[PDB]
Amino acid sequence: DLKKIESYLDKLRIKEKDGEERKIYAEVLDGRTLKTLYKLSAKGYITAMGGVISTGKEANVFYADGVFDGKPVAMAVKIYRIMDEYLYGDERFDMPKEKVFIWTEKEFRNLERAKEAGVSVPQPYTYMKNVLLMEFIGEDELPAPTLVELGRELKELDVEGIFNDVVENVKRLYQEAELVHADLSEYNIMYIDKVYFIDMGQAVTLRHPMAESYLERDVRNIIRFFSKYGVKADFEEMLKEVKGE
Numbered sequence: 001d002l003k004k005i006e007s008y009l010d011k012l013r014i015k016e017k018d019g020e021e022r023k024i025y026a027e028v029l030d031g032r033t034l035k036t037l038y039k040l041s042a043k044g045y046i047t048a049m050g051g052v053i054s055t056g057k058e059a060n061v062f063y064a065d066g067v068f069d070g071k072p073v074a075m076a077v078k079i080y081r082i083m084d085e086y087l088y089g090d091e092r093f094d095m096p097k098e099k100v101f102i103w104t105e106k107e108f109r110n111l112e113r114a115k116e117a118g119v120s121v122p123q124p125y126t127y128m129k130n131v132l133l134m135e136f137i138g139e140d141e142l143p144a145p146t147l148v149e150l151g152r153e154l155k156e157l158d159v160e161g162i163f164n165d166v167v168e169n170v171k172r173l174y175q176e177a178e179l180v181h182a183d184l185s186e187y188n189i190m191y192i193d194k195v196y197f198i199d200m201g202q203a204v205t206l207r208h209p210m211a212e213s214y215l216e217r218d219v220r221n222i223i224r225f226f227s228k229y230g231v232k233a234d235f236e237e238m239l240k241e242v243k244g245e
């Protein structure tokens, strides 16, 4: 399967000179993944695969130039490697390999749902098998920082403003998308000049048995994080603000 990978890496134009990229792509992705990326290029979604943005246990994220809705766009390409409590209980999905494809579709559908409700998430473009294409958040192929990445640079920003941005986005997600993120924290929120929520495969519908418990957890994470930056908030007030109580 190494021969297959190297071949697709050539066809995708992921070159030796493109830094450490070719070695990272060849280890983190597999032949069948790169086949799907090359079918996406052929179909006109991807013009050029770019740098490696993140490598994880569940997912890898890469930059690409691509085309969506007739125009050139910057893309985040998120790829799930080929979870349960967050799938089961979500009735939207009529229940190894196939499981990863559902999860991909799950995240895509959640992005679309959240976006339609007015939540600040990356514009979703398309998915295919284990690959999800979405709006690149950042500039000049540099990803926007997450809240953790921001660090004490937050002290120089309007932290309370950022907090209130976060809360408003959770409230829309809940009241208008009827979803709970379920892994909301400083690690999954990005900021350029407004916050964006990312990482939504696990998000569940308010029909899920655990939605309220996951929501309470999200709220506590956000109060915990912002307490370190001088923002005074109460759990009851934020929860009620979000749930419209």
Ligand SMILES: Nc1ncnc2c1ncn2[C@@H]1O[C@H](COP(=O)(O)OP(=O)(O)OP(=O)(O)O)[C@@H](O)[C@H]1O
Binding pocket: 053, 054, 055, 056, 058, 059, 061, 076, 078, 122, 134, 135, 136, 137, 138, 143, 144, 146, 187, 188, 198, 199, 200, 201
């Ligand atoms: N749309 C995007 N635009 C720019 N950067 C992104 C985008 N999506 C993700 N990233 C970057 O890639 C990193 C990893 O993304 P993400 O949080 O979705 O997955 P993960 O935590 O590594 O694994 P998984 O999503 O499957 O749980 C993010 O912290 C962010 O820095």
Ligand SMILES: [Mn+2]
Binding pocket: 187, 188, 199
């Ligand atoms: Mn994440």
